[PDB]
RNA sequence: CCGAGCCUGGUGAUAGCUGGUUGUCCAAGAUAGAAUCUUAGUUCAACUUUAAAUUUGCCCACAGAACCCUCUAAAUCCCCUU
RNA sequence: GCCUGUUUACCAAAAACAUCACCUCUAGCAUCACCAGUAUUAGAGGCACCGCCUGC
RNA sequence: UUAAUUUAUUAAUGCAAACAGAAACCUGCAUUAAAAAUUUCGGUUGGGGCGACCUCGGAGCAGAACCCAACCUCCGAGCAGUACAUGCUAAGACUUCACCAGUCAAAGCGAACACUCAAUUGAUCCA
């Protein structure tokens, strides 16, 4: 990671994280399952069912991805007809 | 136009589909039936061998 | 600490070259002028005989093979029994080509019954099954039956009500199950008629004494055909040199155990796919002395000279064998090498 | 490691474009199965068109 | 340039002496008509697999004979064990038959003097060898 | 100080390696592992620290945890009271 | 080891290298080398003078 | 050096170009070599060798919840077969001591009237 750029002197964003992950404004990171398109003929329907699901990264992984991206990706967006719009905020959350 | 052509194509194929299923199901029974006759014929040929022993 | 700066290192030979060198020294003296003729046949691809699956449409397959000019040597040999004058295991149909013909059979195609029409196997490997003289209602025990070159032939006869197929290697056993499943219909294998196990053959000399009338024993040995071509799991590599040294010992032990397993008055055929006389006749003589000295068991080796003359047309036989019969490969008849010896228990 | 079976692709005869992959033995005729088609929500005939690979 | 490539291949790729090249061309005129790839393959077969050095090739008229008959005769002798490929040092276990004996003499004489096999056996080997050659070309 | 001269520059080359790492006082504070061209390292977990929130935590009475298996083992896990 | 000669300046002077002699390889020719030369010449090598030796 | 990656460079041919009327020089694009350039030398174990080993599963050590190591003590696995709703979805849990992966699953929709197997497997990018 480049903490200070050579032409602007500011932190950069790793484009590997952006393409492979989605960040909700609540802080959660949504990713895909590694291997949801690989050798589907030898996998049971139950196994394939959880491979094509979107899962949340844990605390350690989420903290790692917050340092590899700049604040432009942590801002709140208001896209029209956003499939993940309802998941940008937590409800009935304690502690 | 593309949606209607696909819908018409699906409807046209599904029109013949019940007849195709019956023909396919009928052929599967016939193919097994031909093999079953061969199984009986094998016993008949093996019955000839028993005749030779006797 | 290991020393990696040796003054002289033995040059690395391929396992094929290692097998060729050992065979060249031993077999040149044993066979004399016939070794060069044998050697070319070993290096050339062996001819494959088409064994008709009796469970499938055998009559239709026979007609199909006749179109490819295939000739049933088994049927020809049966008519030769009276011409020359225990007989042999009946209900076997194997089609091969003419002497000197290089035509290869097409791959087998499953029939209407869902089973393969025929099995492709060496024609020299069918002789031990024929020499076994199988009869209906008998109980047949096969040691080292996997992958099933001779195991499948026994079921084609239909003379074995109960079969005990045992091979030490489970990987070979797994191949045997698939071959039986693809060829033999499930109804026969449904019951206890075919028993496929994976245990040491030495155990069969104690667990089942006098249980079986006909026992076929094909002990593991240095396969001349496979060693000179295959590069995987070759017995002639340096790591497996220890196994080759103890190989004749296992051949004596496994054969002796099978002899204990058979009932007195039964027939035991010893089969080996090799040309080395130190593993063909000496093993047979080793087992005979082993039984008499340790368990006081006497066996009689039958004469295969009558059997030799019947297949002389389609097979090449070596006429300088003390006890067993050795079928040497030839350019015209590429079947072999095969060594089979028949002994009965008294 | 001889390829005893092969992986083939079955195409629906209803024209819906639905397809699924199945495993079949190499030495066998092309399969003609009766599989469920989610597009029409009923079982429809399928026919083998192209072999994908060897297993 | 067709002549230029042939002699250059002999002098550079085959590394034949200029004196040897003159004797080769006078003795064997079929070299010019032969394709460069087959000519190079024919030469290296004698040098490596057979073990024949440059002076012996020129004197024995190796290049004039067809490639196919060389393959049939050499491999059969090699499989017979009569012919042993020289090792790294150049020594051989059993002295090889003379090269002129293998090639110059007729097929019937070739079997009798060296192979010591029946005529029928050699006929089967050629068909078997051609199948292996046919498979070898397809695999490559 | 020639298995590739010397000098200058790139150059504050790089070194998972060696050495060093400067005032006072108090407090908490040690040994499960996994992956690794990796076992002289690093990452994660375990452990440890501070802050914060909350309510149970530890100890443990019966009951309860397999047969082919009598080394018919010492003893655990679970666990209200306390 | 033919010989005189040469080499590790600063741990090896030698059986090592070179050396006449012999052998192999390459080249048919001008105007800065080879060369102001031309197959009895030039270059690239091996061996180390000289003398002697079979089988086939 | 028959390690990998290249022919820029050099030389020899081919074509295009350019010419005369045929050719050469030059230039571009190729194919052959030549001579070089860049870079690397997987770990584990083994003093008298001519190698074995690296992933996954079961049994003993590890006797009774779980876990628990070798140079350990033993056997294997890199499949096949039957299905063709081996369809679509969804509470609550397990988890090989992390992660990645892996496993079970009520209800519901739709049909019938979570296949066997201890292992039988390969991520991302890319095509
Ligand atoms: C040369 S093969 C013979 C194959 C088979 N009998 C045939 O002819 O088709 C010998 C087989 O014996 C098996 N084998 C080796 N050792 C064995 C043993 N100790 N007990 C039983 N079988 C053994 C090996 O798996 C090997 O595949
Ligand atoms: K390190
Ligand atoms: K000096
Ligand atoms: Mg200096
Ligand atoms: Mg530094
Ligand atoms: Mg303290
Ligand atoms: Mg790696
Ligand atoms: Mg001197
Ligand atoms: Mg003098
Ligand atoms: Mg000095
Ligand atoms: Mg000195
Ligand atoms: Mg010298
Ligand atoms: Mg670079
Ligand atoms: Mg876990």
Q: At how many Å resolution was this determined?
A: 3.1
Catalytic residue among C144, C159, C160, C273: C273
- Residue whose CA is at the smallest distance from ligand 1 atom 15: C220
DSSP for B3-54? Answer: HHHHHHHHHHHHHHHHHHHHHHHHHHHHHHHHHHHHHHHHHHHHHHHHHHH-
Task: Answer for the pair C230, C280: CB distance below 8 angstroms, yes or no.
Answer: no
Of all nucleotides, the one whose C1′ comes closest to residue A59's CA is H99
Same domain (yes/no): C309, C213: yes
Neighbours, chain A (3 or more CB pairs < 8 A): D
Q: Which residue has the tokens 């250059």?
A: E8
Q: Whose CA is closest to C86, among C255, C267, C325?
A: C267
Q: Whose CA is closest to C336, among C117, C108, C125, C181?
A: C125
> Do the chains contact at B35 and C113, CB–CB below 8 Å?
yes
* Inside any domain, residue C267: yes
DSSP E63: T
C-alpha–C-alpha distance, residues C71 and A39, integer Å: 47
Task: Give A47's Cβ-side CA count (13 Å radius).
Answer: 11
Structure tokens at E39: 């000519």
Structure tokens at C162: 């109960």
C-alpha–C-alpha distance, residues C302 and B14, integer Å: 72
* Inside any domain, residue C85: yes
C-alpha–C-alpha distance, residues E125 and E76, integer Å: 8
Q: Whose CA is closest to C132, among C214, C213, C220, C219?
A: C214
**C150 appears as a binding residue in the annotation:** yes
Angle, vertex CA A79, rays to CA A77 and CA A82, nearest 5: 110
- Residue E87 Cα, ligand 12 centroid: separation in angstroms? 30
DSSP E42: H
- Domain total in chain C: 2
Strand G close to E18 by CB, under 7 A: yes
- Residue A19 Cα, ligand 13 centroid: separation in angstroms? 30
**Smallest Cβ distance to C112: which of B35, B45, B49?**
B35
* Inside any domain, residue C70: yes
- In angstroms, the first-to-last Cα distance of chain E is 30
Chain F: positions less than 7 Å from a protein CB are 44-45, 53-54
C-alpha–C-alpha distance, residues C162 and E61, integer Å: 68
Which atom of ligand 1 has the smallest separation from the CA of C145? 6
Instruction: Using the 3D structure, point to which of C72, C91, C121 is the last residue of a domain.
Output: C121
Q: Whose CA is closest to C44, among E122, E42, B47?
A: E122
C205 lines ligand 1 (CB under 6 A): no
- Quote the distance between the C-alpha of residue C136 and its chain's center: 21
> Do the chains contact at C57 and B38, CB–CB below 8 Å?
yes
Of all nucleotides, the one whose C1′ comes closest to residue C178's CA is H80
Which helix (H) or strand (E) covers residue D42, if one does? strand D42-54
Chain A residues close to D22, C-beta within 8 Å: 41
C112 shares contact with chain B (CB less than 8 Å) = yes
Same domain (yes/no): C170, C182: yes
C-alpha–C-alpha distance, residues C340 and C129, integer Å: 10
Same domain (yes/no): C129, C32: no
Task: Answer for the pair C340, C311: CB distance below 8 angstroms, yes or no.
Answer: no
By CB atoms closer than 10 A (0-12, 13-18, 19+), residue E123 is: middle
The residues that bridge with D11 in the sheet, in sequence order, are: D19, D47
With both helix axes pointing from N to C terminus, report the angle between E67-80 and E119-139 in degrees, rounded to the nearest 10. 110
Instruction: Using the 3D structure, point to which of C95, C121, C147 is the last residue of a domain.
Output: C121
Structure tokens at C207: 């667990």
Task: Answer for the pair C149, C123: CB distance below 8 angstroms, yes or no.
Answer: no
Check if C160 is active-site. no
The CA distance from B12 to the nearest CA of chain C, in Å, is 34
Task: Answer for the pair C273, C220: CB distance below 8 angstroms, yes or no.
Answer: no
- Enumerate long-range contacts of C76-84, CB under 8 Å, 24 or more apart: C76/C313, C76/C314, C77/C310, C77/C311, C77/C314, C80/C310, C81/C310, C84/C306, C84/C309, C84/C310
The residues that bridge with C196 in the sheet, in sequence order, are: C165
Cβ count near C85 (within 10 Å): 6
Chain C residues close to B42, C-beta within 8 Å: 57-58
Q: Structural domain of residue C55, as residue ranges?
A: 13-121
The CA distance from E60 to the nearest CA of chain C, in Å, is 27
D45 shares contact with chain B (CB less than 8 Å) = yes
C174 lines ligand 1 (CB under 6 A): no
Chain B residues close to C59, C-beta within 8 Å: 45
Q: What is the dihedral of CA A55, A56, A62, A64, to 10 degrees?
A: -20
- Breaks in chain B (C to N over 2.5 Å), named by the residue before each, are none
Same domain (yes/no): C111, C176: no
C-alpha–C-alpha distance, residues E9 and C175, integer Å: 53
- Kindly give the pairing relationship between strand C71-72 and strand C194-197: unpaired
C226 lines ligand 1 (CB under 6 A): no
Q: What is the dihedral of CA C266, C129, C182, C49, to 10 degrees?
A: 180
Q: Which residue has the tokens 């029939």?
A: C111
Rg of chain B in Å (alpha carbons): 23
Q: Which residue has the tokens 């078997």?
A: E128
DSSP D39: T
C-alpha–C-alpha distance, residues D8 and D48, integer Å: 7
- In angstroms, the first-to-last Cα distance of chain D is 9
Which residues have CB under 8 Å from D6's CB, separation 6+?
Answer: D23, D24, D25, D26, D51, D52, D53, D54, D55
Structure tokens at C338: 């095969």
Chain H: positions less than 7 Å from a protein CB are 12-14, 33, 45-52, 75-90, 98-105, 110-111, 114-115, 120-125
C-alpha–C-alpha distance, residues A54 and B7, integer Å: 33
Expt. technique: cryo-EM
C-alpha–C-alpha distance, residues C212 and C160, integer Å: 10
C200 lines ligand 1 (CB under 6 A): yes
* Inside any domain, residue C1: no
Structure tokens at E60: 């024995």
DSSP D44: E
- Residue A64 Cα, ligand 2 centroid: separation in angstroms? 25
* Inside any domain, residue C241: yes
Task: Answer for the pair E103, E110: CB distance below 8 angstroms, yes or no.
Answer: no
C-alpha–C-alpha distance, residues E114 and E98, integer Å: 10
- Residue whose CA is at the smallest distance from ligand 1 atom 8: C149
Which helix (H) or strand (E) covers residue E24, if one does? helix E18-27
* Touch A-D: 3+ C-beta pairs under 8 A: yes
C-alpha–C-alpha distance, residues E40 and D18, integer Å: 56
Task: Give C65's Cβ-side CA count (13 Å radius).
Answer: 29
Which helix (H) or strand (E) covers residue E71, if one does? helix E67-80
The residues that bridge with D46 in the sheet, in sequence order, are: D12, D33
Domain boundaries, chain D: 4-55
Number of residues written out for chain D: 55
The CA-based diameter of chain B, rounded to the nearest angstrom, is: 78
Dihedral angle sign, alpha carbons of residues E75, E77, E79, E85: negative
C-alpha–C-alpha distance, residues C214 and C343, integer Å: 11
Same domain (yes/no): C269, C287: yes
- In angstroms, the first-to-last Cα distance of chain B is 78
Structure tokens at C30: 């044993």
Strand H close to A15 by CB, under 7 A: no
C-alpha–C-alpha distance, residues D44 and D39, integer Å: 10
Task: Answer for the pair C241, C229: CB distance below 8 angstroms, yes or no.
Answer: no
Which atom of ligand 1 has the smallest separation from the CA of C218? 6
C-alpha–C-alpha distance, residues A76 and A73, integer Å: 8
The residues that bridge with C269 in the sheet, in sequence order, are: C216, C342
**C167 appears as a binding residue in the annotation:** yes
Instruction: Using the 3D structure, point to which of C121, C136, C160 is the last residue of a domain.
Output: C121
**What CATH number was assigned to the domain covering residues D4-55?**
2.20.28.120
Q: What string of H, E and C letters represents the secondary structure of chain C?
A: CCCCCCCCCCCCCCHHHHHHHHHHHHHHHHHCCHHHHHHHHHHCCCCCEEEECCCCCHHHHHHHHHHCCCEEHHHHHHHHHHHHCCCCCCCCCEEECCCCCCCCCCCCCECCCCCECEEEECHHHHHHHHHCCCCCCEEEEEECCCCCCCHHHHHHHCCEEEEEEECCCHHHHHHHHHHHHHHCCHHHHHCCCEEEECCCHHHHHHHCCCCEEEEEEECCCCCHHHHCCCCCCCCCCCCCHHHHHHHHHHHHHHHHHHHHHEEEEEEEEEEECCCCHHHCHHHHHHHHHHHHHHHCCCEEECCCHHHHHHCCCCCCEECCCCCCEEECCCCCCCCCCEEEEEEEEC
Structure tokens at C339: 């060594």
Which helix (H) or strand (E) covers residue D5, if one does? strand D5-12
Q: What string of H, E and C letters represents the secondary structure of chain A?
A: CCCCCCCCCCCCCCHHHHHHEEECCCCCEEECCCCCCCCHHHCCHHHHHHHCCCEECCHHHHHHHHHCCCHHHCCCCCCCCCCCHHHCCCCCCCC
Task: Answer for the pair C134, C154: CB distance below 8 angstroms, yes or no.
Answer: yes
- Quote the distance between the C-alpha of residue C257 and its chain's center: 18
Which residues have CB under 8 Å from A45's CB, separation 6+?
Answer: none
Angle, vertex CA E8, rays to CA E7 and CA E11, nearest 5: 85
Structure tokens at E90: 């150049």
**C12 appears as a binding residue in the annotation:** no
Structure tokens at E29: 């005129």
- Enumerate long-range contacts of C73-77, CB under 8 Å, 24 or more apart: C73/C123, C73/C311, C73/C313, C73/C314, C74/C126, C74/C130, C76/C313, C76/C314, C77/C310, C77/C311, C77/C314
C227 lines ligand 1 (CB under 6 A): no
Structure tokens at C186: 């499930």
Same domain (yes/no): C84, C131: no
Which residues have CB under 8 Å from C108's CB, separation 6+?
Answer: C50, C116, C117, C118, C119, C120, D27
* Inside any domain, residue C6: no
* Inside any domain, residue C3: no
- Residue A28 Cα, ligand 11 centroid: separation in angstroms? 82
Dihedral angle sign, alpha carbons of residues C223, C224, C225, C226: positive
C-alpha–C-alpha distance, residues E19 and C297, integer Å: 79
- Residue C94 Cα, ligand 2 centroid: separation in angstroms? 67
Same domain (yes/no): C335, C296: yes
Strand H close to A71 by CB, under 7 A: no
* Inside any domain, residue C65: yes
């Amino acid at each position: 990671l480049t903490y200070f750029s050579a032409r602007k002197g500011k932190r950069k964003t790793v484009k590997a994280v952006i393409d492979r992950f989605l960040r909700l404004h609540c802080g959660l990171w949504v990713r895909r399952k590694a291997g949801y398109k690989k050798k589907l003929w030898k996998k049971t329907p139950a196994r394939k069912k959880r491979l094509r699901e979107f899962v949340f990264c844990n605390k350690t992984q989420s903290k790692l991805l917050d340092k590899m991206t700049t604040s432009f990706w942590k801002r709140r967006n208001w896209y029209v007809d956003d499939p993940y719009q309802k998941y940008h905020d937590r409800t009935n959350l304690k502690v | 136009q593309k949606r209607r052509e696909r819908e018409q194509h699906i409807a046209e194929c599904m029109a013949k589909m019940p007849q195709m299923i019956v023909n396919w199901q009928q052929q599967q029974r016939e193919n097994w039936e031909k093999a079953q006759a061969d199984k009986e014929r094998r016993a008949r040929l093996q019955a000839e061998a028993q005749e030779l022993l006797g | 600490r290991y020393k990696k700066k040796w003054a002289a290192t033995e040059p690395k030979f391929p396992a094929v070259r290692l097998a060729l060198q050992n065979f060249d020294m031993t077999y040149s003296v044993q066979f004399g002028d016939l070794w060069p003729s044998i050697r070319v046949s070993l290096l050339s691809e062996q001819k494959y005989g088409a064994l008709v699956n009796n469970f499938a449409a055998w009559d239709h397959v026979s007609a199909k093979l006749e179109q490819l000019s295939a000739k049933d040597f088994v049927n020809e040999a049966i008519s030769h029994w009276e011409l020359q004058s225990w007989a042999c295991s009946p209900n076997l149909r194997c089609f091969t080509f003419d002497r000197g013909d290089i035509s290869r059979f097409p791959p087998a195609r499953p029939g209407s019954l869902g089973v393969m029409e025929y099995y492709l196997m060496d024609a020299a490997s069918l002789l031990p099954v024929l020499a076994l003289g199988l009869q209906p209602g008998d109980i047949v025990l096969d040691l080292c039956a996997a992958p099933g070159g001779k195991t499948l032939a026994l079921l084609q006869t239909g003379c074995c009500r109960n079969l005990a197929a045992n091979d030490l290697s489970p990987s070979r056993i797994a191949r045997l199950q698939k071959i039986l499943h693809s060829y033999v219909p499930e109804e026969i294998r449904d019951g206890n008629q075919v028993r496929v196990t994976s245990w040491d053959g030495r155990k069969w000399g104690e667990l089942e004494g006098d249980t079986y009338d006909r026992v076929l024993v094909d002990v593991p040995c240095t396969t001349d055909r496979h060693s000179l071509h295959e590069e995987e799991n070759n017995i002639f590599k340096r790591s497996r040199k220890k196994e080759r040294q103890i190989l004749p010992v296992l051949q004596v032990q496994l054969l002796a155990a099978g002899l204990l397993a058979t009932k007195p008055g039964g027939h035991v055929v010893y089969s080996t796919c090799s040309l080395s006389h130190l593993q063909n006749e000496y093993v047979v003589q080793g087992a005979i002395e082993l039984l008499a000295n340790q368990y006081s068991i006497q066996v009689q080796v039958e004469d295969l000279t009558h059997f030799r003359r019947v297949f002389m047309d389609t097979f090449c036989f070596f006429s300088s064998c003390q006890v067993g019969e050795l079928v040497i490969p030839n350019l015209m008849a590429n079947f072999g090498p095969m060594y089979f010896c028949k002994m009965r228990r008294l | 490691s001889k390829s005893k079976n092969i992986l083939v692709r079955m195409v629906s005869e209803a024209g819906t474009g639905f397809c699924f992959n199945t495993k079949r033995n190499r030495l066998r005729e092309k399969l003609t199965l009766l599989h469920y088609d989610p597009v029409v929500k009923q079982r429809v005939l399928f026919v083998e068109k192209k072999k994908i690979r060897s297993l | 340039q067709d002549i230029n490539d042939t002699v250059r291949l002999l002098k550079e790729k085959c590394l034949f002496t200029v004196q040897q090249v003159t004797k080769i061309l006078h003795s064997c005129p079929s070299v010019l008509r032969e394709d460069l790839g087959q000519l190079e393959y024919k030469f290296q077969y004698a040098y490596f697999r057979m073990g024949i050095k440059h002076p012996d090739i020129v004197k024995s008229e190796y290049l004039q004979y067809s490639l196919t008959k060389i393959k049939q005769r050499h491999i059969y002798l090699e499989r017979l064990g009569r012919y042993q490929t020289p090792d790294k040092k150049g020594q051989t276990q059993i002295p090889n038959p003379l090269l002129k004996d293998i090639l110059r003499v007729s097929e019937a004489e070739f079997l009798a003097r060296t192979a010591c096999t029946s005529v029928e056996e050699f006929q089967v080997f050629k068909k078997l060898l051609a199948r292996e050659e046919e498979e070898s070309e397809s695999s490559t």
